[PDB]
Write an enzyme that holds these catalytic residues in place. Structure first.
Site, PDB file in Angstrom:
ATOM      1  N   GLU A 357       0.829  -1.212   0.000  1.00 51.14           N
ATOM      2  CA  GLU A 357       0.000   0.000   0.000  1.00 51.14           C
ATOM      3  C   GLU A 357       0.861   1.258   0.000  1.00 51.14           C
ATOM      4  O   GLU A 357       0.400   2.319  -0.431  1.00 51.14           O
ATOM      5  CB  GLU A 357      -1.031   0.132   1.142  1.00 51.14           C
ATOM      6  CG  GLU A 357      -0.569   0.365   2.585  1.00 51.14           C
ATOM      7  CD  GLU A 357      -0.238  -0.881   3.327  1.00 51.14           C
ATOM      8  OE1 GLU A 357      -0.079  -1.903   2.670  1.00 51.14           O
ATOM      9  OE2 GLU A 357      -0.136  -0.837   4.570  1.00 51.14           O
ATOM     10  N   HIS A 487     -16.922 -11.529  -5.744  1.00 52.98           N
ATOM     11  CA  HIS A 487     -16.460 -10.526  -6.695  1.00 52.98           C
ATOM     12  C   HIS A 487     -17.480 -10.244  -7.790  1.00 52.98           C
ATOM     13  O   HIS A 487     -17.433  -9.168  -8.396  1.00 52.98           O
ATOM     14  CB  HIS A 487     -15.133 -10.965  -7.313  1.00 52.98           C
ATOM     15  CG  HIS A 487     -14.361  -9.849  -7.945  1.00 52.98           C
ATOM     16  ND1 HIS A 487     -13.288 -10.067  -8.781  1.00 52.98           N
ATOM     17  CD2 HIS A 487     -14.495  -8.506  -7.848  1.00 52.98           C
ATOM     18  CE1 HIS A 487     -12.801  -8.906  -9.183  1.00 52.98           C
ATOM     19  NE2 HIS A 487     -13.514  -7.943  -8.629  1.00 52.98           N
TER      20      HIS A 487
END
Ligand SMILES: [Zn+2]
EC number: 3.4.17.23
Lengths: 596, 97
Positions: A357, A487
């Site tokens: 990240e 998903h």
């Protein structure tokens, strides 16, 4: 007066108030992701309400603005991304029952509880239940029962609902002046207007299918290895010529094969690379590891960061009364406001993810100077890819040895590195099978090539011949396999992860020949690679003003995606797989079934 | 002045201008607040068809980055004319012997 000036004025305004609104909306979001309180829900809701209202007003009033007589090749992207007729073409009632049907289906997915037989009290939400049973137990009967229950109690409830939603999406796509909804998502990759560098909506089909066919032998050897390990584990339930059971791949959808790593490891005597006890010995915290990664980014020439990062972003679990999410995410609050959320724990996985990240932080920072509707990558697959390239590059043992994590006396061995390669194959290579299966399956489903009454049956043929997965329990049209997936329960394109997987290895190879690395590709580090750092900055400084094909031509010189790096990085793994499978049968049959 | 001028709720006081028909000569203070006419249709003094308010607020918050935080700027300009030039500058002195 010409219309170009009017468009420029409008887009400048749109940028202004849109970045303002996004700023306070993301401020409320970073408020919520660290505190759970009701008024925070309220103000996020109403701020998003003004967000949507003004966006809809501007898009509706700009719908009348044409594209023929507007130049500069970059305002065109603004107009294309701002028009966004979407589902607003149809009536208001149609949008209403679309909203409610999406709400009902997402809730049905989230509220899918599996209750044990003969006791309707110990129901499992799959969050505290099978998520650890699958990773800590090897019970065939329990896994089969849970698999059947999950595909029966859920999909049967919304199979007609799924059909209705698919029909509605295809109808709105047709009203959108596209051939089908698959083409509607393919329109995101639509590139034209620049000679030589164009890109059609059918070229991706052809090149992805060709690359899949080229890679196919690697999957064949991997499937043979997994099958051989399965006979080594369960010789009384897997045929040596048939297909593998669905609930023995590693997960329910066949996405990750990592759960079998501890079962498929050929050399378990030598432990893998794990230096968590090392950092525990030096009592390192999130601050220390983040300073380590900070100077690691410094070493590749990338600049430092400002104060708001560390007196605005909190990097621990608050515990006590303040409740916060522990899913690590980098938040782009907009206009110089960049923050990171992560619950700190001692784990190498957390180490690589944190690198992940923070690389995303630099990723989003790269296009900070662009107009508001241009603050993304040229495509979408660059994102989690550029985020992970540096983590994967630093995963080499040389980087760990240099920075003190690994002792100098630790001599590199072939066994541990081969174990890492096999872990990669079970993790990264294992995502591709389900990826192309689901993706091509949805492209043929949404194209109208599959009869409604023969849908479920049509799901099986390629499943028995492409991915080599045979159902432990036969399924009729009552079952609905795609409804079991998260998903698609929120309707996202699955191509994203395939793009990440295929792009990444090309990226680290490009970095390596930029750094003039010599030797194996799996022994290459990006430390002291300032020239490649600035070249990568030149790659990420564009944003959404040019085609991603030009980005690929800039990084290596290819206007079409290349799968050569994928083969060169696993040539040792390919040779070892061939050596291991030279004494085992190659291929499988599509007629055998465990249920006869 | 990030320490002072940045208030949490947002310092919505001060203004910028971002759209003007033409440039400006050096050293004049214009306080025109008329709606910019980007489109050929008249603005009628109100926001609308290609018509927007030229002035928008700063909206400063403490969370803003170094490049976005407020900065106070003062410009000193010297003018010498046909006058005895009153303002000169300090002159030192020493003890007498
Ligand atoms: Zn990433």
């Amino acid at each position: 007066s010409t219309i170009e000036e009017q468009a420029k004025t409008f887009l400048d305004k749109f940028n202004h108030e849109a970045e303002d609104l996004f700023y306070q909306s993301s401020l409320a979001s970073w408020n919520y992701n660290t505190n759970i309180t009701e008024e925070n829900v309220q103000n996020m809701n109403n701020a998003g309400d003004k967000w949507s209202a003004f966006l809809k007003e501007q898009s509706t009033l700009a719908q009348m603005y044409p594209l023929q007589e507007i130049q500069n090749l970059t305002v065109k992207l603004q107009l294309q991304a701002l028009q966004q007729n979407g589902s607003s073409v149809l009536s208001e009632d149609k949008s209403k029952r679309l909203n409610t049907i999406l709400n009902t289906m997402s809730t049905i997915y989230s509220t899918g509880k599996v209750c044990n037989p003969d006791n309707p009290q110990e129901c499992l939400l799959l969050e505290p239940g099978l998520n650890e049973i699958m990773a800590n137990s090897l019970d065939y009967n329990e896994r089969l029962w849970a698999w059947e229950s999950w595909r029966s109690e859920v999909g049967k409830q919304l199979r007609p609902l799924y059909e209705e939603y698919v029909v509605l999406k295809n109808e709105m796509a047709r009203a959108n002046h596209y051939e089908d909804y698959g083409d509607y998502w393919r329109g995101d990759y639509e590139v034209n207007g620049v000679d030589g560098y164009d890109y059609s909506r059918g070229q991706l089909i052809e090149d992805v299918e060709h690359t899949f066919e080229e890679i196919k032998p690697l999957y064949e050897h991997l499937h043979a290895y997994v099958r051989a390990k399965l006979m080594n584990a369960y010789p009384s339930y897997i045929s040596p010529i048939g297909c593998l059971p669905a609930h023995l791949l590693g997960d329910m959808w066949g996405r990750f094969w990592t759960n079998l790593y501890s079962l498929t490891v050929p050399f378990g005597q030598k432990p893998n690379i794990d230096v968590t006890d090392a950092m525990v010995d030096q009592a390192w915290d999130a601050q220390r590891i983040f300073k380590e990664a900070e100077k690691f980014f410094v070493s590749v020439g990338l600049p430092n960061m400002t104060q708001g990062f560390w007196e605005n972003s909190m990097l621990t679990d608050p515990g006590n009364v303040q409740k916060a999410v522990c899913h690590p995410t980098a938040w782009d609050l907009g206009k110089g406001d960049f923050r990171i959320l992560m619950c700190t724990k001692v784990t190498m996985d957390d180490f690589l993810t944190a690198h992940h990240e923070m690389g995303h932080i630099q990723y989003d920072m790269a296009y900070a100077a662009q107009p508001f509707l241009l603050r993304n990558g040229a495509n979408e697959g660059f994102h989690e890819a550029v985020g992970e390239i540096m983590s994967l590059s630093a995963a080499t043992p040389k980087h760990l040895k240099s920075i003190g994590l690994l002792s100098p006396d630790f001599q590199e061995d072939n066994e541990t590195e081969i174990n890492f390669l096999l872990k990669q194959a079970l993790t990264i290579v294992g995502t591709l099978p389900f990826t192309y299966m689901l993706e091509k399956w949805r492209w043929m489903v949404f194209k109208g090539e599959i009869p409604k009454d023969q849908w479920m049956k049509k799901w099986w043929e390629m499943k028995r011949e492409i991915v080599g997965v045979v159902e432990p329990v036969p399924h009729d049209e009552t079952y609905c396999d795609p409804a079991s997936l998260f998903h698609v329960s929120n309707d996202y394109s699955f191509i994203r992860y395939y793009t990440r997987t295929l792009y990444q290895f090309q990226f680290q190879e490009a970095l390596c020949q930029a750094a003039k690395h010599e030797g194996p590709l799996h022994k290459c580090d990006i430390s002291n690679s300032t020239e490649a750092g600035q070249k990568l900055f030149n790659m990420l400084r564009l944003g959404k003003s040019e085609p991603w094909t030009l980005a690929l031509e800039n990084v290596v010189g290819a206007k079409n995606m290349n799968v050569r790096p994928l083969l060169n990085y696993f040539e040792p793994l390919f040779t070892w797989l061939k050596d291991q499978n030279k004494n085992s049968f190659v291929g499988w049959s599509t007629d055998w079934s465990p249920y006869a | 002045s990030n320490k002072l001028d940045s208030k949490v709720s947002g310092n919505y006081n001060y203004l910028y201008r971002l759209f003007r028909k033409s440039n400006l000569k050096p050293f004049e203070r214009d306080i025109s607040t008329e709606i910019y006419q980007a489109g050929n249709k008249p603005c009628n003094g109100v926001a609308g068809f290609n018509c927007y308010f030229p002035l928008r607020s700063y909206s400063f918050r403490p969370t803003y980055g170094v490049g976005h935080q407020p900065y106070r700027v003062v410009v000193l300009s010297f003018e010498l004319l046909h006058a005895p030039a009153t303002v000169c500058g300090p002159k030192k002195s020493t003890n007498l012997v």
